[PDB]
Write an enzyme that holds these catalytic residues in place. Sequence first.
Site, PDB file in Angstrom:
ATOM      1  CG  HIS A  36      36.286  71.432  63.616  1.00  0.00           C
ATOM      2  ND1 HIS A  36      36.929  72.497  63.053  1.00  0.00           N
ATOM      3  CD2 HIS A  36      35.073  71.365  63.013  1.00  0.00           C
ATOM      4  CE1 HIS A  36      36.142  73.074  62.158  1.00  0.00           C
ATOM      5  NE2 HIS A  36      35.009  72.400  62.116  1.00  0.00           N
TER       6      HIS A  36
ATOM      7  CG  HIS B  22      31.677  70.820  66.613  1.00  0.00           C
ATOM      8  ND1 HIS B  22      30.700  71.711  66.249  1.00  0.00           N
ATOM      9  CD2 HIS B  22      31.927  70.082  65.517  1.00  0.00           C
ATOM     10  CE1 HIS B  22      30.366  71.515  64.986  1.00  0.00           C
ATOM     11  NE2 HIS B  22      31.105  70.542  64.513  1.00  0.00           N
TER      12      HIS B  22
ATOM     13  CG  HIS C  96      29.909  65.783  62.183  1.00  0.00           C
ATOM     14  ND1 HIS C  96      29.555  65.993  63.484  1.00  0.00           N
ATOM     15  CD2 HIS C  96      30.345  66.967  61.697  1.00  0.00           C
ATOM     16  CE1 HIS C  96      29.824  67.256  63.803  1.00  0.00           C
ATOM     17  NE2 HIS C  96      30.321  67.868  62.738  1.00  0.00           N
ATOM     18  CG  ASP C  97      33.542  67.774  62.412  1.00  0.00           C
ATOM     19  OD1 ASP C  97      33.785  67.756  61.180  1.00  0.00           O
ATOM     20  OD2 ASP C  97      33.027  68.742  62.990  1.00  0.00           O
TER      21      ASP C  97
ATOM     22  CG  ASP D   4      28.653  70.710  60.917  1.00  0.00           C
ATOM     23  OD1 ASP D   4      29.152  70.744  62.034  1.00  0.00           O
ATOM     24  OD2 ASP D   4      29.281  70.390  59.880  1.00  0.00           O
TER      25      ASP D   4
ATOM     26  CG  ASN E 282      28.240  76.870  66.523  1.00  0.00           C
ATOM     27  OD1 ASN E 282      29.297  76.817  65.959  1.00  0.00           O
ATOM     28  ND2 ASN E 282      27.767  75.845  67.204  1.00  0.00           N
TER      29      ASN E 282
ATOM     30  CD  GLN F 129      30.536  84.459  63.737  1.00  0.00           C
ATOM     31  OE1 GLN F 129      29.482  83.788  63.709  1.00  0.00           O
ATOM     32  NE2 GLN F 129      31.715  83.983  63.292  1.00  0.00           N
TER      33      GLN F 129
ATOM     34  CG  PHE G  20      28.934  82.361  59.389  1.00  0.00           C
ATOM     35  CD1 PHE G  20      28.943  81.401  58.389  1.00  0.00           C
ATOM     36  CD2 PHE G  20      28.820  81.920  60.742  1.00  0.00           C
ATOM     37  CE1 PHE G  20      28.800  80.042  58.727  1.00  0.00           C
ATOM     38  CE2 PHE G  20      28.713  80.555  61.067  1.00  0.00           C
ATOM     39  CZ  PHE G  20      28.667  79.628  60.062  1.00  0.00           C
TER      40      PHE G  20
HETATM   41  O1  LIG Z   1      34.785  73.453  56.716  1.00  0.00           O
HETATM   42  C1  LIG Z   1      35.522  74.399  56.399  1.00  0.00           C
HETATM   43  O2  LIG Z   1      36.101  74.386  55.164  1.00  0.00           O
HETATM   44  C2  LIG Z   1      35.782  75.560  57.347  1.00  0.00           C
HETATM   45  C3  LIG Z   1      34.653  75.840  58.338  1.00  0.00           C
HETATM   46  C4  LIG Z   1      33.342  76.126  57.909  1.00  0.00           C
HETATM   47  C5  LIG Z   1      32.350  76.369  58.829  1.00  0.00           C
HETATM   48  C6  LIG Z   1      32.658  76.348  60.210  1.00  0.00           C
HETATM   49  C7  LIG Z   1      31.607  76.663  61.287  1.00  0.00           C
HETATM   50  C8  LIG Z   1      31.671  78.126  61.740  1.00  0.00           C
HETATM   51  C9  LIG Z   1      32.144  79.130  60.902  1.00  0.00           C
HETATM   52  C10 LIG Z   1      32.171  80.462  61.401  1.00  0.00           C
HETATM   53  C11 LIG Z   1      32.652  81.572  60.569  1.00  0.00           C
HETATM   54  C12 LIG Z   1      33.594  82.430  61.091  1.00  0.00           C
HETATM   55  C13 LIG Z   1      34.066  83.476  60.328  1.00  0.00           C
HETATM   56  C14 LIG Z   1      33.532  83.714  59.084  1.00  0.00           C
HETATM   57  C15 LIG Z   1      32.583  82.902  58.589  1.00  0.00           C
HETATM   58 CL1  LIG Z   1      31.960  83.216  56.973  1.00  0.00          CL
HETATM   59  C16 LIG Z   1      32.133  81.801  59.312  1.00  0.00           C
HETATM   60  N1  LIG Z   1      31.715  80.764  62.614  1.00  0.00           N
HETATM   61  C17 LIG Z   1      31.241  79.809  63.428  1.00  0.00           C
HETATM   62  C18 LIG Z   1      30.728  80.212  64.775  1.00  0.00           C
HETATM   63  F1  LIG Z   1      29.449  80.371  64.676  1.00  0.00           F
HETATM   64  F2  LIG Z   1      31.035  79.270  65.610  1.00  0.00           F
HETATM   65  F3  LIG Z   1      31.203  81.364  65.188  1.00  0.00           F
HETATM   66  C19 LIG Z   1      31.215  78.476  63.025  1.00  0.00           C
HETATM   67  C20 LIG Z   1      33.958  76.090  60.624  1.00  0.00           C
HETATM   68  C21 LIG Z   1      34.942  75.818  59.681  1.00  0.00           C
HETATM   69 MG   LIG Z   2      33.283  68.679  59.454  1.00  0.00          MG
HETATM   70 ZN   LIG Z   3      31.204  69.813  62.344  1.00  0.00          ZN
END
Ligand SMILES: O=C(O)Cc1ccc(Cc2cc(-c3cccc(Cl)c3)nc(C(F)(F)F)c2)cc1
Ligand SMILES: [Mg+2]
Ligand SMILES: [Zn+2]
Length: 334
Positions: A73, A77, A113-114, A228, A231, A279, A282
């Site tokens: 973040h 990003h 946004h972040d 967002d 990726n 992943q 996800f």
């Molecule tokens: O906001 C929040 O509360 C927390 C939060 C939510 C979504 C993201 C983005 C993200 C998430 C994941 C990922 C990794 C492991 C498991 C799962 Cl389910 C998703 N991966 C990637 C990737 F693509 F960059 F690798 C990106 C980052 C933080």
């Molecule tokens: Mg955010």
């Molecule tokens: Zn973001």
Amino acid sequence: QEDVLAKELEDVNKWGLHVFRIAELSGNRPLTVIMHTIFQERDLLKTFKIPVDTLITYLMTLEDHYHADVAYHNNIHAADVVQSTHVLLSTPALEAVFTDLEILAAIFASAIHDVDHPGVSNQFLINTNSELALMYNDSSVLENHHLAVGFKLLQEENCDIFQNLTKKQRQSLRKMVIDIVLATDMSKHMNLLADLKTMVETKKVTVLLLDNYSDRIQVLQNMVHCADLSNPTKPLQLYRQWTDRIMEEFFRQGDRERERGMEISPMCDKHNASVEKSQVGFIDYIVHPLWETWADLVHPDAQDILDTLEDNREWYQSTIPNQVSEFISNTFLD
Ligand SMILES: O=C(O)Cc1ccc(Cc2cc(-c3cccc(Cl)c3)nc(C(F)(F)F)c2)cc1
Ligand SMILES: [Mg+2]
Ligand SMILES: [Zn+2]
Ligand SMILES: [Zn+2]
């Protein structure tokens, strides 16, 4: 150095821009250079009478309030999300649908946004009774903070990039940006998606038709949310870097939790991780359903994106040597 950077920026309208290379080449100013480039391409400086030195000054300031020590973040990003939004806005199905103000709102929302993200989740900030969660009453904590900082920086010396908008334009832009950034709270994902589904189910074409603010803003909210969560739709060499970064950031949060004697959150335990299975999950539970719905909305413009996503899934699946489900339930539901 400058020459090479310019060659890389020629891909600014393409999905799969080499954003990390841009970051190294710009002296770690990917947000500033990408935003500047986009503002030039779309003629937003002429349209909104944004003095160029004011743009550069605001962008450098904004960039400085992204945390370079946060692995995912950070400004890179932010630059990525901006650029991804910029591509999405140009999709054939949305040609001439959005006004210039709405375009400016989506891009600006993407840039901020972040901002000032600390590298820990909303839920961590709530559970530790942090100052931020106290300020914002446990709801959309970070997202409310990103907005407040993003706007507050306009007030620094020579930073007001909206000084020549009309009062009405400034209010409308402010409201759109708030609506957009608050929809980036990941816990709103299911609600957003349900709405996007409904919009697809009742879509009218001629190119998409959007009669009202409500419909337009909803599309912008989903667009930036897709950006967002883009990726896994990117060329695999990019995706894998994003994966390494988010896992680093998660593992650092888990180390903080460990040091304080808290239960380690899902995905945050470096001693017990399954990067590749996570992943896949996800993608299957969150990214593919969202992007398959965005692809319907803009059919057939997003087909390549969907295909890349499906290839990238196979790759993570093929490299596999409770936590995923707990993470999803806690992160993406209201
Ligand atoms: O906001 C929040 O509360 C927390 C939060 C939510 C979504 C993201 C983005 C993200 C998430 C994941 C990922 C990794 C492991 C498991 C799962 Cl389910 C998703 N991966 C990637 C990737 F693509 F960059 F690798 C990106 C980052 C933080
Ligand atoms: Mg955010
Ligand atoms: Zn973001
Ligand atoms: Zn400051």
